[PDB]
Amino acid sequence: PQPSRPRKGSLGFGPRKRSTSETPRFNSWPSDDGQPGVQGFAGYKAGMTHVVLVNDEPNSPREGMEETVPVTVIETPPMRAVALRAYEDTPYGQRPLTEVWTDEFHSELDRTLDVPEDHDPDAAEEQIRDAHEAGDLGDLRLITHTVPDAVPSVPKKKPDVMETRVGGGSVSDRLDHALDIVEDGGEHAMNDIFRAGEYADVAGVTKGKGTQGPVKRWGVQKRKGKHARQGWRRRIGNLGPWNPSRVRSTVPQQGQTGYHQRTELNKRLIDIGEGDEPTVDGGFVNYGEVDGPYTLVKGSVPGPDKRLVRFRPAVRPNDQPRLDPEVRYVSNESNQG
Amino acid sequence: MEALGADVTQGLEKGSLITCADNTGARELKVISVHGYSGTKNRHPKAGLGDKITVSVTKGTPEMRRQVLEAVVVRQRKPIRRPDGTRVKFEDNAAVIVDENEDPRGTELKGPIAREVAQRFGSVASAATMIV
Amino acid sequence: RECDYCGTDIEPGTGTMFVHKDGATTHFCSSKCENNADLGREARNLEWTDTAR
RNA sequence: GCGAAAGCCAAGGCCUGUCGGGAGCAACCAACGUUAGGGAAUUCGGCAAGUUAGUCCCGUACCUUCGGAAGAAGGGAUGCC
RNA sequence: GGUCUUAAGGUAGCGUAGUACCUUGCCGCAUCAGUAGCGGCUUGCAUGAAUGGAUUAACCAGAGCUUCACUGUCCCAACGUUGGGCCCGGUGAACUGUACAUUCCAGUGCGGAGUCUGGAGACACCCAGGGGGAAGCGAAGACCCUAUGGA
RNA sequence: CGAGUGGCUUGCUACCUCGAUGUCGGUUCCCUCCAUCCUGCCCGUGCAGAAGCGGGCAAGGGUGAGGUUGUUCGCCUAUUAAAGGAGGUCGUGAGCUGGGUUUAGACCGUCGUGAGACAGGUCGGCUGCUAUCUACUGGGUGUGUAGGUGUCUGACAAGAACGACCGUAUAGUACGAGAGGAACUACGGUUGGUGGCCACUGGUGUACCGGUUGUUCGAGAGAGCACGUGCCGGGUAGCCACGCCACACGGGGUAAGAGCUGAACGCAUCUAAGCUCGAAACCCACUUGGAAAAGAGACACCGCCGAGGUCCCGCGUACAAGACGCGGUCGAUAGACUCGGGGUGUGCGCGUCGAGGUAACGAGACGUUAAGCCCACGAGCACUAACAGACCAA
């Protein structure tokens, strides 16, 4: 009587088109708890290696034993928070008001941006404080940027700029926290926002696969048996019924696969360190030798080796924090075996 | 069920001819169902190491043959994954017959067993010869 | 740990443990060696193995 | 090599089963190779594909019109010097 | 019923058959499970003796079933190979075309509408695609009835 | 006995189509209905518990694998939480299959004088077309908004992004004479679905290394050919799943429902006004799209005679055209050379042994030799090539 079966592929990540910004753009940010700070960092993917750990979970009978866990190596060099942005509470949502900029810029930041020469930070800051006094000030975010020139394995020197929210304390004390980072130069490492053992959210634009068919794209069945030899192999049964006399957008069809933005949830940071402890023998494949500031992210991470990834404190965690894990062994073996 | 403490790749299907690692008079066993498993459209119900499966005796003694008895998958050919990352695979795919209370139908079990089957079916473990 | 075939220092969290009919246990560092044993080749007789040299 | 069999090569003929250039060359289709574990669960039906395979030796059942069955089946062997 | 029609009134065999409606007949074998298949029973809707009956060694690109072996047929799809496919030069057709035509959801209508009514939606052009729709294209339906039609 | 809803079965009618709207069953793929099989929350009980029985709300999700038969239907087996039913031209042949019905061939049974017949059986018996319009999946180019860059907003849009079971403790506890035997909660895992990634396992790898059969270049060395690798063994990068990683809690308002205050009706009453609670369901949360939102958006900076872009050049984190992204000497973008990291498995030549053989001759072994040959990765290195130079533009 035609056995049931769930539809092929998800209908949430639609439409499956090419992404606009290769740089991930968050749409959700964490809730305000305690200390005022930035709500996110960013780095560049390097590759993968396995690490041996000691089970931190008190609910697991393996508590204390050696466990091998896969880890994505991502180089995370210090970023510069070059500006501060404010949002006014308009009946049309949250619209931007004004930005507070610096004086000390990076030698190669003029590869993307039109670097300000004459700006008035003082009176712009006054407008934000008058909007705060009025009671219409929304959420305060910082215009962050990366230093790709810090990574020797990435050919790009043209900085990837992105907006990041600041939250935690009262609207008054966090506006001031933000301004304080900006007046210095905005230098901040991963140590400033993230602690090892915490759950973060890695957002990244996936690997580019070009135009692929229904079977690969929406995971549909290949033609089975006799039906595989008649001239139809990787094409689906039909585009729809007689009536509705139109093809629905829900039917698994051909198109662009890959280069989609994904926000991979609850990613455990296994270790945040500096130097050449996670590097591989012969270098990382299609990337190179890692020597410097990094992060070790559990499991996999969206995108290829060389692409920009973004971090955020987990908006929806399930397990309670188990800070600083006992990282016994980190592998250095060649990925060419 | 209680965790195995290892990730398995289901090495058997329904209709799969496996070995009977015991002295019950049963030589060859044929998988029929996998206790507690519910599949999807167009999929052969897969069985793995440490699964209580419904079985029928293919080859054996006249009194034991043609019987529908329950059993536990003791050994398999497809690699299973131990927590330390190491893979483990056996020589053949075997199972031992079991009863209502999960006790082995025989007394002496032939060939090696896996240490993961021990946690779950302990009454089979305290009757096991070798444990790997 | 050390490999029960080639004598190569196996990297932890990388490998296969083949159990035998009788119950014996053999570890292999990579796939290359698993296949060499099934062929009938001996580790001592083959020049490339860390057992020979 | 049993062979007017295959495969390779002469003598001889030809590059005219007569449009080309470019993209690691996507999806999709035609021919097709290899696929771990399981092994017909596929399907009306093993359709398709596959397995066996030459030669030598041992051995060969029921039945049979005594001709056959039968290369039954099954087991061993096979290079080079 | 214990003859009557119309001469006789199914003998050997074979049999739920390529023939049995009932029928997936009942028993059994075989499978976890067998409208299948084989064996036996068999009152055979409506088997049967050259309208040939029965049996059979051998033979068969003849129909059905079971086992061993093998395998991407499947579980479940992956990578690869060659010619295409895509872009450039050159060559250069055809099928089809009442008109208009960016549609969709309902409704209405000769009861199966892109074109009517009401709404919704809708900036234009172009590339690749797989073919839902145009009751798509292709053929004055072979079916069916009709004709004081044909063979 | 009476009253009806439905349009799934059948029947009736003959409105529609005979200048053809392709059958049944199956399959693949998509949206839907509720008259709910499971899952959630509830009411009653012939509700002790436990497993049920019957009813209410509810369509989010699920409802699977197999034996006979073309079967739809149905009978059957084992698993399951359950293995619900129906609509979409009895969904779907310019998608598939072609087993059944329904051609020409043939057999059997019945009827027929006979040709031949059968809503009896049976064997064999074909599946066309280069897409104009529209539809949707994805990809570009223009115009509008009215000079450039970078960052955002959010009207709207999509989702199931999660469903489900098992086990542990609770506890052999509540309950029950006993047998038997739960819950709230906190945990661990499994299955189905979903998205991403390749350290590891695996697959592939007609890159590559090796062995070896036939044959041809005299032998050797070294090569071609044997379907697009002769075959056999091993197999890196990459891509992959059979591998690995991640996929809530909580709120807000209800439904059925349990109730509170409360009158008409001095009492009573959950309801008429008012209110507290209560579903896997609804909104939010979360993920993806999203300035063409014609109200055609906001901020920061830069420039309007120069901001910025295009061509060009060297290439990919991109790629069917187009698009996109990075680098262009203030440089490591690509190649060569050298390391390093990898694959294979011990080079050619020479030396010793070698069954033997009068000698010539000799398959082969050892050594020289982790040797030789090879690499789609990395490092180092400006040696080579990113040169020269064009255009547009407020």
Ligand SMILES: C=C[C@]1(C)C[C@@H](OC(=O)CSCCN(CC)CC)[C@]2(C)[C@H](C)CC[C@]3(CCC(=O)[C@H]32)[C@@H](C)[C@@H]1O
């Ligand atoms: C043959 C016509 C076919 C192809 C199939 C036809 O079915 C029949 O007409 C019954 S006889 C079918 C077989 N036919 C040969 C194909 C016998 C002559 C069938 C299903 C109907 C019953 C009649 C109408 C129809 C078009 C609509 C439809 O469903 C078709 C005709 C016009 C179509 O051309």
Ligand SMILES: [Cl-]
């Ligand atoms: Cl198919």
Ligand SMILES: [Cl-]
């Ligand atoms: Cl089953």
Ligand SMILES: [Mg+2]
């Ligand atoms: Mg590797």
Ligand SMILES: [Mg+2]
């Ligand atoms: Mg390895």
Ligand SMILES: [Mg+2]
């Ligand atoms: Mg099926």
Ligand SMILES: [Mg+2]
């Ligand atoms: Mg296989």
Ligand SMILES: [Mg+2]
């Ligand atoms: Mg089937």
Ligand SMILES: [Mg+2]
């Ligand atoms: Mg019969």
Ligand SMILES: [Mg+2]
């Ligand atoms: Mg028959």
Ligand SMILES: [Mg+2]
């Ligand atoms: Mg006729």
Ligand SMILES: [Mg+2]
């Ligand atoms: Mg006539």
Ligand SMILES: [Mg+2]
């Ligand atoms: Mg006509």
Ligand SMILES: [Mg+2]
């Ligand atoms: Mg039509």
Ligand SMILES: [Mg+2]
């Ligand atoms: Mg109801």
Ligand SMILES: [Mg+2]
């Ligand atoms: Mg629904």
